[PDB]
């Protein structure tokens, strides 16, 4: 691929560098349009700026804490972190969110990597060999209320068992109801004065419920579960203005009141360098 | 002969002329078209009320003063009371439409100022309350009057900071969206042809706004001395390749 | 079974390793692709779209006036603006080019710098737009500036000049992070003649400045950006 053509002196009526940006078109003006150039070659295909590569590496999307402890006399196993569940979203952690929100619509298969790490902060004396269940819970599937109830037997829910310390790995196809996920949705679920703006089921990717399969030890064990997401077979539409302000919420474009200026102020006037 | 400044757009019984145009934008180089059968899922035979709805509808004119921040309209919401298009929008469960948008602002060769005219697909607005506060239905559905970005914040309404595009992205980066400038020196009209842009083939028209039109002063209006310090801006919108599916009773929306 | 030795890195999770993995949803049939306009295949497409530069970042608050470069009538020979060309920094940091460039470590190729004049139609100005290639200072008196790559812009019926900043570097790639060895040089604008306003018009007129990339533009070594940040995870 030619990067620049050879070009010499011009004295001409064809003036490529004058245009009208009122038209909303940016003209493809080359350096050979206004300086004398030599011939150079690209040696460059642009592969690492493909949207398959730009959105196609594993990003941490959720960190959650579950505990292995004695569950006798515990009323609310959810509140005691005997299990935990997570509505799967790619907007809770903001480095991946800003990349996805360069586009309006995005279609991809998902690849999940789930890392579980343990710690015993208070007076343990051994190695707890623990197994984590991670259960993909679609909408309308029964959600767990106990860490050991009937819902964890996974007769139709996909679940994965893996040891604490090593990881899990599975792919999930594109499960959007529409042809792509909506990163942005200027609307409502229905016509109603009170109903929520922006949050739509058009980017629902499922839900994961996590528990420790082991009963309990003498000591407590805290398990941090880190879910990493990698998009693949990515298709993206409608490029957008990039996020400039801090995010405040999942599924909403709200930015905080009294934010710091995002455009840096010069150490001088407009003539400074 | 062939001049880029002199344009005629005829849809239905409506015609727009301009003698000071700047070469209409077709968004993403895609002319609006009807839904093909290979993309369709809804089994209903669609109604195509061609000349009765695919015509220019003129909204109320705004007044661009020297302290104006800008204006935002939602589509199809800005046309919800416009003739037969507004009636079909509430009687049908489903509908898809492209648009020809024509923003008009003339002045003299003594005036200066520049309007950005931009179409934003899925312009999900931010609340001014921050946090997880929603924006209520009556604020994202203002109708023909649109949203005045110099008006004050209201409870349940959007944030109206024009520098952050009402969504937390900077004003200078709106040019990735399809746009034209109305630079008063150069042109008095902007024309943007919008195809139907959505992740679904056809959609509900009252609960969802597909695109938003923003008209934003960038270079502020400077009038010659002694002249009236304001200019009118007129928006005229024509739906095109308009389909409606799922006829039933008329929807009742908050209004 | 077949005998096997296991290599270093076994059991590691490398976040950029692209391997096949079992589907949690066997026999699932995803929604049909419909045609949607504006499909993006590569980010090098959309950095060729010009966005506005907040060149007048002299205010203590983000505002629309930060995009407006002021011109003054009775000024000969003087500077209109200046900037360095660290495109992951300064006035370029919030532009679309600068924000995509901050996802990468290395950049190369030519930049497209545009100025749109927005004054009255009965006004006239000639400006000079100078690129100073690196190894010299930012120019100080327009005589220094025109010794480098420059354009004399006559403002007329066509309101927009396009100054390509040509790739002027010995090293094949520059850092997107500001680095002195890979500094890209300086951009400056000067009154070539002056701004002449018509009668009954007064005050300042404004330039709008635009940045995009030429199609020779190269971008590599993907990295995190510092622009977005958080302290805690976000919730519903």
């Amino acid at each position: 691929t030619v990067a620049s053509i050879s070009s010499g002196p011009k004295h001409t009526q064809k003036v490529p560098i004058l245009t009208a940006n009122e038209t909303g078109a940016t003209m493809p003006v080359l350096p050979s349009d206004s300086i004398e150039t030599r011939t150079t070659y690209m040696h460059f295909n642009g592969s690492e700026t493909d949207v398959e590569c730009f959105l196609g590496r594993a990003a941490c999307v959720h960190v959650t804490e579950i505990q292995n402890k004695d569950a006798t006399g515990i009323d609310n196993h959810r509140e005691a972190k005997l299990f935990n569940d997570w509505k799967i979203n790619l907007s809770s952690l903001v480095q991946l969110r800003k990349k996805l929100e360069l586009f309006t619509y995005v279609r991809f298969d998902s690849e999940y990597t789930i890392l579980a790490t343990a710690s015993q902060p208070d007076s343990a004396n051994y190695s707890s060999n623990l197994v984590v269940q991670a259960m993909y819970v679609p909408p309308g599937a029964p959600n767990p209320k106990e860490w050991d109830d009937y819902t964890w037997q996974s007769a139709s829910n996909p679940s994965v068992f893996f040891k604490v310390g090593d990881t899990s790995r599975f792919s999930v196809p594109y499960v959007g109801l529409a042809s792509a996920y909506n990163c942005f949705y200027d609307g409502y679920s229905h016509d109603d004065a009170e109903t929520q703006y922006g949050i739509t089921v058009l980017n629902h990717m499922g839900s994961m419920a996590f528990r420790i399969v082991n009963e309990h030890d003498e000591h407590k064990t805290l398990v941090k579960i880190r879910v990493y997401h990698r998009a693949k077979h990515v298709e993206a539409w409608i490029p957008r203005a990039p996020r400039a302000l801090p995010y405040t919420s999942i599924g909403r474009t709200n930015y905080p009141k009294n934010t710091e200026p995002v455009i840096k102020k010069r150490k001088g006037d407009i003539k400074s360098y | 002969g062939y001049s880029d400044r002199v344009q005629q757009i005829t849809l239905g019984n409506s015609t727009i002329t301009t003698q000071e145009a700047a070469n209409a934008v077709v968004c993403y180089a895609e002319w609006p078209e009807y839904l093909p059968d290979v993309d369709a899922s809804d089994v209903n035979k669609t109604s195509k009320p061609d000349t009765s709805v695919c015509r220019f509808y003129t909204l109320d004119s705004k007044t661009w003063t020297t302290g104006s921040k800008g204006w935002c309209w939602k589509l199809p919401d800005a046309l919800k009371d416009m003739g037969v298009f507004g009636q079909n929008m509430f009687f049908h469960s489903l509908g898809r439409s492209g648009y020809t948008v024509h923003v008009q602002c003339n002045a003299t060769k003594f005036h200066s100022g520049c309007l950005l005219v931009v179409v934003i697909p899925e312009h999900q607005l931010a609340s001014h309350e921050g946090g997880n506060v929603s924006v209520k239905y009556t604020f994202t559905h203002p109708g023909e009057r649109g949203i005045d970005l110099s008006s004050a914040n209201e409870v349940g309404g959007p944030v109206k900071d024009v520098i952050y595009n009402m969504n937390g992205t900077l004003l200078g980066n709106l040019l990735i969206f399809p746009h034209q400038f109305i630079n008063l020196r150069t042109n008095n009209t902007a024309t943007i042809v919008i195809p139907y842009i959505n992740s679904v083939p056809i959609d509900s028209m009252t609960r969802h706004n597909n695109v938003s039109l923003m008209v934003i002063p960038i270079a502020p209006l400077t009038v010659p001395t002694g002249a009236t310090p304001s200019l009118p801006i007129t928006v005229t919108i024509a739906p095109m390749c308009t389909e409606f599916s799922g006829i039933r009773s008329k929807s009742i929306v908050p209004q | 079974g077949l005998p096997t030795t296991t290599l270093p890195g076994s059991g590691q999770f490398l976040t950029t390793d692209d391997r096949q993995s079992p589907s949690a949803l066997p026999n699932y049939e995803p929604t049909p692709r419909i045609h949607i306009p504006g499909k993006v295949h590569n980010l090098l497409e959309i950095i060729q779209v010009d966005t506005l530069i907040p060149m007048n970042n002299t205010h203590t608050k983000d505002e629309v006036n930060s995009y407006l470069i002021p011109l003054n009538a009775n000024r000969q020979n003087e500077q209109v603006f200046g900037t360095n060309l660290f495109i992951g920094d300064g006035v370029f940091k919030t532009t679309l080019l600068g924000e995509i460039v901050q996802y990468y470590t290395h950049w190369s190729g030519s930049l497209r710098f545009s100025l749109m004049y927005t004054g009255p139609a009965l006004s006239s100005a000639k400006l000079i737009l100078a690129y100073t290639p690196p190894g010299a200072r930012g120019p100080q008196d327009r005589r220094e500036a025109m010794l480098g790559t420059h354009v004399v812009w006559d403002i007329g019926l066509q309101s927009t000049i396009v100054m390509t900043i040509p790739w002027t570097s010995g090293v094949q790639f520059r850092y997107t992070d500001p680095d002195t060895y890979t500094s890209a040089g300086f951009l400056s604008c000067w009154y070539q003649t002056s701004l002449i306003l018509p009668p009954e018009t007064t005050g300042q007129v404004y330039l709008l400045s635009f940045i995009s990339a030429c199609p020779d533009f190269k971008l590599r070594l993907m990295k995190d950006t510092q622009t977005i940040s958080q302290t805690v995870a976000l919730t519903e």
Partner: antibody
Framework: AVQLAESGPALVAPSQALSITCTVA????????VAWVRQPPGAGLEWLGA???????DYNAALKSRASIAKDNSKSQVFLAMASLATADTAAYYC??????????WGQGTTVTVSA | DIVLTQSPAALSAAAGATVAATCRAS??????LAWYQQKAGKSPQLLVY???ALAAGVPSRFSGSGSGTAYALAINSLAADDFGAYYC?????????FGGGTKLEIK
Amino acid sequence: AVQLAESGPALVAPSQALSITCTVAGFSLTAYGVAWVRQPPGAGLEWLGAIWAAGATDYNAALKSRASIAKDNSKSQVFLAMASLATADTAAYYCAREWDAYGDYWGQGTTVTVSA
Amino acid sequence: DIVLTQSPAALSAAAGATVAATCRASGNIHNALAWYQQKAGKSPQLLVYAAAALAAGVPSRFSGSGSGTAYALAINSLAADDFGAYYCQHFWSTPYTFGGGTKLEIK
């Protein structure tokens, strides 16, 4: 440090030309304009004029025939020369420089009095 | 020609009260206004530029507001260094005329 220093004769007769020199320091006169402002004792600031960074000047609409500003880029000196001083020209005269297209870094000022 | 009309000529209040000088112009300034304070026997000091931005070394009590033709310097909870002169000056389209002036003297 950026400093502008006024230097005047501090006593002038009427129908005699005033000549005030503005020695500047810490910047070039090829890069920044210089503003002149006077203040009669008791009354408010009045803008006299400005020589811009490359030699163009603007003045009072009322004192345009009566005042002239020039500079020397080699001596770093800006000159305010007013002719035919009436009694209204008794003031403390100040120098400023261009800053974000405005005026600041005002020097201590020289006091000018004119009488018989 | 643009003339600035500043009100009021005198304000008298205690330390901790809030004053508000008002600046009006004969034509639109597009926020190209500065505010100056001047002590007795002292050069003027730039405090507000572009009608809203505080200068260097200016405390957060001073807040410049206003746009178009009407402009306002507001001092919230006056400290002891706030007394003296206050002047408008527009920097849109030479001549760069001043306002009349506003005094702060102790109640």
